[PDB]
Design a binder for this molecule. Sequence first.
Ligand SMILES: Nc1nc2c(ncn2[C@H]2C[C@H](O)[C@@H](COP(=O)(O)OP(=O)(O)OP(=O)(O)O)O2)c(=O)[nH]1
Ligand SMILES: Nc1nc2c(ncn2[C@H]2C[C@H](O)[C@@H](COP(=O)(O)OP(=O)(O)OP(=O)(O)O)O2)c(=O)[nH]1
Ligand SMILES: Nc1nc2c(ncn2[C@H]2C[C@H](O)[C@@H](COP(=O)(O)OP(=O)(O)OP(=O)(O)O)O2)c(=O)[nH]1
Ligand SMILES: Nc1nc2c(ncn2[C@H]2C[C@H](O)[C@@H](COP(=O)(O)OP(=O)(O)OP(=O)(O)O)O2)c(=O)[nH]1
Lengths: 481, 481, 481, 481
Amino acid sequence: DTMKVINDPIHGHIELHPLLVRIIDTPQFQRLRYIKQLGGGYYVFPGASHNRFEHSLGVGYLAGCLVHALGEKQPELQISERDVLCVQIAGLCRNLGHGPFSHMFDGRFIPLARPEVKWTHEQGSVMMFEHLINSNGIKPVMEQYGLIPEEDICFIKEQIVGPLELWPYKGRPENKSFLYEIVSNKRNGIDVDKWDYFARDCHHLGIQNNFDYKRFIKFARVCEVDNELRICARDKEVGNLYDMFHTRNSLHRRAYQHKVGNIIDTMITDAFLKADDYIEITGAGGKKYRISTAIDDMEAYTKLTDNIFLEILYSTDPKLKDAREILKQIEYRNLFKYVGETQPTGQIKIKREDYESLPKEVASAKPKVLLDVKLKAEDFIVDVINMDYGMQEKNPIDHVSFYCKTAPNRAIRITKNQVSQLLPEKFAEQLIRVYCKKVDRKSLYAARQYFVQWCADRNFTKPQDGDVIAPLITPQKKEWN
Amino acid sequence: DTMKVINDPIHGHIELHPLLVRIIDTPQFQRLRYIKQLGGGYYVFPGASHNRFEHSLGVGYLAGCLVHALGEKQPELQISERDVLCVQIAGLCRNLGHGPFSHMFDGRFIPLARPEVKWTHEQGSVMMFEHLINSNGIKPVMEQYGLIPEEDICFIKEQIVGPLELWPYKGRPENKSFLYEIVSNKRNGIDVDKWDYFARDCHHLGIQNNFDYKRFIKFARVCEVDNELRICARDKEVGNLYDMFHTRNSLHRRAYQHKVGNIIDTMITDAFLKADDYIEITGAGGKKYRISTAIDDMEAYTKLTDNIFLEILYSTDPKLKDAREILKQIEYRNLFKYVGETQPTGQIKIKREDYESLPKEVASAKPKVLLDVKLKAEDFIVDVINMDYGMQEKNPIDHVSFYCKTAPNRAIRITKNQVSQLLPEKFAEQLIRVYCKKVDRKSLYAARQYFVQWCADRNFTKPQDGDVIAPLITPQKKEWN
Amino acid sequence: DTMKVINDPIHGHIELHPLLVRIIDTPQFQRLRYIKQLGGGYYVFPGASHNRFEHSLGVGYLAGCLVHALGEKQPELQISERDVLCVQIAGLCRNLGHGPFSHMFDGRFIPLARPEVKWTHEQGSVMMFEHLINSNGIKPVMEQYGLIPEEDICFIKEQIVGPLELWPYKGRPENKSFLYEIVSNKRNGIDVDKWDYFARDCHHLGIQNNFDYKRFIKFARVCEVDNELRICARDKEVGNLYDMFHTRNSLHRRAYQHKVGNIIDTMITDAFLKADDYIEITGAGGKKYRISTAIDDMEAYTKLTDNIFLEILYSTDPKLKDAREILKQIEYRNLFKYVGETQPTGQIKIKREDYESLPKEVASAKPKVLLDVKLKAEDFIVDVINMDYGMQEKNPIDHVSFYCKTAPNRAIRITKNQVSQLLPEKFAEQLIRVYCKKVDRKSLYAARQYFVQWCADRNFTKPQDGDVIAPLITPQKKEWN
Amino acid sequence: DTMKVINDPIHGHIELHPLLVRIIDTPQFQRLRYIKQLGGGYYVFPGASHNRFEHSLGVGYLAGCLVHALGEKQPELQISERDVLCVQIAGLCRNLGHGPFSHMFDGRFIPLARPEVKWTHEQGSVMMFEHLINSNGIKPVMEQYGLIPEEDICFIKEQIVGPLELWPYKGRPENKSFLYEIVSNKRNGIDVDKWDYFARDCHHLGIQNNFDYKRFIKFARVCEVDNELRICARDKEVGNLYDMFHTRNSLHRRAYQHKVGNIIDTMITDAFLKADDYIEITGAGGKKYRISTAIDDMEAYTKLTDNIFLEILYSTDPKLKDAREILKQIEYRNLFKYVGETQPTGQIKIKREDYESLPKEVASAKPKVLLDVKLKAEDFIVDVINMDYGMQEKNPIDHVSFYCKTAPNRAIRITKNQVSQLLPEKFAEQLIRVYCKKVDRKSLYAARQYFVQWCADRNFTKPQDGDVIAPLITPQKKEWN
Ligand SMILES: Nc1nc2c(ncn2[C@H]2C[C@H](O)[C@@H](COP(=O)(O)OP(=O)(O)OP(=O)(O)O)O2)c(=O)[nH]1
Ligand SMILES: Nc1nc2c(ncn2[C@H]2C[C@H](O)[C@@H](COP(=O)(O)OP(=O)(O)OP(=O)(O)O)O2)c(=O)[nH]1
Ligand SMILES: Nc1nc2c(ncn2[C@H]2C[C@H](O)[C@@H](COP(=O)(O)OP(=O)(O)OP(=O)(O)O)O2)c(=O)[nH]1
Ligand SMILES: Nc1nc2c(ncn2[C@H]2C[C@H](O)[C@@H](COP(=O)(O)OP(=O)(O)OP(=O)(O)O)O2)c(=O)[nH]1
């Protein structure tokens, strides 16, 4: 065994070490070929055919680039080949736990199908990784290339998910703290996973990525901060970091939360729920699981991919008729209709436990207009979306350490007013989308009136098209005019 | 209904007329989302996740651009909105007939599973189109937008497949002859399908496309040639046309016929053959079909996509054990091993009926070397690939009509020696690849010796690595040295 | 004469009407080949070799695209071929008035060399255009193609510079009001000049352009707003407009106001000032002009380009020794040294009349540190830069008209809180850069201390590297820590 | 001093060692900012504003990448930091000798102005480099970074120009032979200079570059070939090498030898010839040079750039009237007119000594057509262009060494028939362009007839538009029809 070269349209020629090749050439990894990076987004942006597999390659490559670059610039850090391999492996392997349609699965489906469980793709990635290592005799191959499985497997898992339980990490000591900032940066979110997806999703969506990760890597150094060694950015890159999260937010606004992409994810999720009793997936020892319980057995989860969409779509069992019908409406483009969007005002923040009650409230609003049809709670869908800079109300740049050219080893902080008065004052907001399940002309008109009345009742922002969709409702509200 | 916009990473914002949108939003069209443009290539180039669906959109868009451009430049042609829509529909619909993994299906699987039938994706596209139209009540919508179904459906079919039987076409008369050169150009192969796939495949593969279709469109005119009106290129674009086919050939060399991509296609094909008795696909009136017979019922063919790969992979039926095992070897990357490549010499041309006997000949060669193991016909795969400029021995530029700036209405011909002595002297060749099903170190070494000996016996070209893989064999052949 | 095609790396193949070709093929237009778009930026970003000439072609092309697109979508507007040509010509010709190194000339040099005059490149473009038309017998060619010079020349001039003096425009009536929003949009700054430079500058600088002008053009419509017909953007594009000005601001931050690019512009300006008495440029009737007075005669201005830099650099006249020395220091990279950057606080806004007194204040600060050398007012340069969204304190999106899909003919307004809480709260700010003319290690250290002390004295923001460059000064200020 | 970073739109962030920075920040290097890479091409492709400066940076960067890569993959080669710097310096400095408009200068002007001298830009680069080193005290800086000027300056000069006089090189011994194959590969022309210009010219011209140099670098190794250590390509890259020269040829066909670009270069050359008696350039010790003699003194040559075009254009001296007039015709686009293009037939090859007599032969042809005007030898220009794969008649791939994956240290050869029957049979050809200095309609018509008759008389290829431009002449020739 020697090194392999892969051509990636984002990164060009990526060299893979033979150990990485062995990890990649397993069912658990190859599975990622059959899970779309952006889920329902492909049904809006037809370039976004890409899957988690190629993204994982890119993340592993970039993890390698950053760690090599630091080591070249600063030999005093004592970064070993062993460290490099462990970081690359973590990079490759942090997407392993994703399920059908990526964020649809852990973001929409599991929460609705198994509300008692608490589950994340990060957790899944750890479990899948364990299963991958054990099912495929990787440990011998690791030690053949100088790894120490007890330490190193812990290190890898920790990079993906955080401390498995004061320095809280057991895979590496504090002098190598900076290594935990590469693959999944818990402190501020500036990590190579983002860098790959910005460039890859833009390339496929047909929009333009504003962020130069190569520049950033070139200006990255390790400096002591509070008795940890941390990655530090050159002071002047601070604008470019602000812009990085601006770009993240734009991609979410235009693509990842596109209103139609999300309603498709919702329809798919409904279909999965209706099929969950009847689909069976064979796991370990011939035991059988549902879509919703495949997460409890990694052998079954291995076989859970975008394929279930098509298994349902192509089924003939009458038990699956309901689920199949929903997916067929997706193909005919008979989708639930978008009514509008709004935001909460001032202090108001909407909690997860209230989400269930929001379609009720909308149906309860009492618009003063003549309506032929009357709509019920169940006719409305209300999607609440939390947009932030990755740390709820917090500014992640306040958690970044910088250095200046005249003292490269001295870490510093930079505040917002030290950069620009043109930056955002807040770093978290919520969007509320409302859709109607009844798609006819008269139902849609009514839904608009309930929606706008509801916005007025709750003192939300005026929908942009409020005066056009609901001309009789909007005048009642003073603030709107 | 009004027009829709789609964002494509190759073409940007594509406007779709409502009629085109109605055609697209059907199960027969949406099916294309689940068929990879490049089949097994995705397993070698991980950027090549793209499907036939986004390619079809691109082809329809480009068909519209070209026909608009001609009409703008030359109103005397009397191109109607009706003509435009019919050309766009043909452009969208010429990929409808592809099956699982695209060219794998009609190039490898169907020929092996049903040698008596003569089947092409083109034929399939016509049948699928008919099915699509009838299953979805499109005819009323066509006449709603000014189309005449009897004429226009014929026109569309003819564009895709040629005359359904002096002027052999019934969809349009000779004065509109040029329209048949847009979507699928039977005369020289210069059409918008190539243009989209060059650009789209390069974007995804991560290689660079040499061909400027926009330029070409801007210099295109219609001129009288032998009492037909034909599309003509400006004289000076002749070098760029030569280059267009050079590019086609390079893409085939590096990507579409990559030796590993092809062996994966072969392994998948094998698995499909072993599964063909046991997989059942439900067609019209609940009737049941095999993978190989789904092409006889369009309702079944609708449900025949890349999904069968995963149906086989994830199956538990012991009847499918053999098929499942082959696909599992693909995931482990336990592939049949490449032995080498060679070409025939001088006049020698290998016919399709001899393909079956080639693994026999290789096993029959008698290399003078000590061999621990001895290999049989069934241990060898021999892939023969015909590379040309799209017209076997012929130079497609001899079938192109040009015009010069001083007489824009006078069509002319340009010969090869009028352009360059640096062009190819031949326009067709064959490549022969040989692989071994026994993958161990000793089997592989033996296979190399049989291979090189066989090349010498048949007076083929010396493999590039001949002197390294078979140092004892290569000296016997004088021509090689 | 017929149409010409030009290949542009940004837009591809641009068709030019013969009239446009005639305008282009004049000394007054071709002059733009010898003026760098980004001036001193080329000395920091070596890909930025591009000149105003190619940018002007792009602007004219884009002006044509937008006006065609509107006309196609809305024939009721009665846009004529005549209207199209006039808009294209305005687009081509709005950069005619730029001088050596573009914004360096009107932004730095003329203000310093002739403070009594008020001069802008826009004014210059009008004068140059008149000169171009008259010197080259264009009027006959205009009427040959259906233009009416009295009306149309006024129209073109007005598009560039505004009303030459209630509907204030004479070139076209109110029913064609929208045409004045294409080339140079006085209302909100959303025009095709920006769209070309975003794309062209990015392509050359090696940074990525976030803005999709093609998308924007597709969603543009004309709607009645207060008895004017105005261009209107689709409501959902409002995020993308915000992002457009965000991008503008980033390009200014990283490129157009790069601290070194600006100091180079300053050094060049200094050299021009020292050479202004001795360089002579022959204008109309053999009369002679200086660099600073060439703006009074268009014949002379025609011959004023980046070439003067090299005329000075290569000169042997001892009268030019001082000017030549400054340029030579640019080649040796002996530049004035950057000391730091800071901003005013809260309400504080610095006016143009106080700029001259700022180097005085810096020298007057009294840092408590041991200094080997002592610096005077003349050793400091203080560059004050006003960054905004193009309308000082105003939000340009408040001056944009939108429309919704359910009422395409009804214009509406959208406020900031109707879009996002993550947008900027202010739309203008100031940056202050300080440089030192004495470049040695000890002078530089001193300058850092004066600078930081001065910042503290004026209650400005703490320089990002304050604690590294001036560790003894920064503790005195409470707010900083 | 520490390292600098430069952002290039082709290569991204390039790191420059301080020594390289010192070389770059000199008048002799910075001079390259004012010489256009493609000369008169900018007047056809307006994106081609790029200068030799940014190209040189790219070449130096790429030289560094290749040498680093070889050293990383094969430490046994003993490549030192010293070796790396010397290769980078050579890469930066191989363009130093170019003159105004690049190839126009040594290809057209010098040969005509000083036919007795034998001069190349390569020779110039060596002299400029010597001048650069001595004028700027670089030798001390070289030794400060571990270079040995006697050896290393020789090494650098040798890389650019070859042996300055059996191992013929003195800068390095045979064991470091491969280092001479990086910057200017005398054996086969595969070097980093091409790689930068392919990518940079394509980016600016707006055409697409087919060559992946990064791929090629990754597969490059050093192997023993005939007791030299040489750079070797992986066997399977052989198609990609063929393609590299195919691309070179296409770039020459469409861009570098564009017929109008070339005639502009000719017109500029003419103007330079007419100005050469009157322009004076001050060189070393106040001594004075002409445009044509500035190559004898590096101090004068330093000041010789594209600027002379504008010095002439803007001059008022009546002695320069003739020269100024020619340049003014360029601005009005009053160019010498292209008549047509043709090639010699079969064996016929045209020698340099016959070039001067070709306009005579054309004027002496006797076409049987009625002509109002009659043209003389001096009214014709005849440009003969030798197109090849860089080695006249020879196939440069026959001078490439390859290696196979099973024996990475064993170099091999690959012949053309081992690759493809679709490759070119010849590797050199000639193109003949003819232009007319009299531009009116009747002079042009006549010139077409002389041209086509002359082609017939010499048994050349039929111009592509022969039957349109000269319908009365073409029938006389049997071979044409
Ligand atoms: N850009 C580019 N990529 C290529 C080309 N040929 C192959 N690739 C891509 C496909 C894969 O992603 C990667 C590896 O392909 P190779 O043909 O280099 O490796 P393979 O393992 O088939 O051959 P080997 O094992 O080294 O004989 O590079 C090419 O000509 N250009
Ligand atoms: N380039 C780009 N494409 C976008 C953006 N937003 C959406 N798209 C893409 C997704 C689709 O392929 C296409 C159309 O999306 P739209 O959101 O304009 O259409 P949609 O039908 O959702 O809106 P509508 O039904 O007209 O309210 O444009 C954007 O900001 N930029
Ligand atoms: N992208 C591309 N651009 C080209 C090619 N050939 C020329 N160009 C560029 C140069 C110009 O910007 C534009 C027009 O060049 P042409 O060679 O088509 O025009 P020219 O006026 O020389 O030919 P003509 O008067 O029509 O015989 O296209 C080509 O093969 N590819
Ligand atoms: N891609 C990119 N390039 C930039 C940016 N800012 C500057 N550049 C370019 C211009 C130069 O070619 C190169 C280095 O410029 P920098 O401003 O980083 O260095 P400078 O020497 O002015 O800063 P320093 O001396 O380190 O304070 O990068 C940016 O935000 N993004």
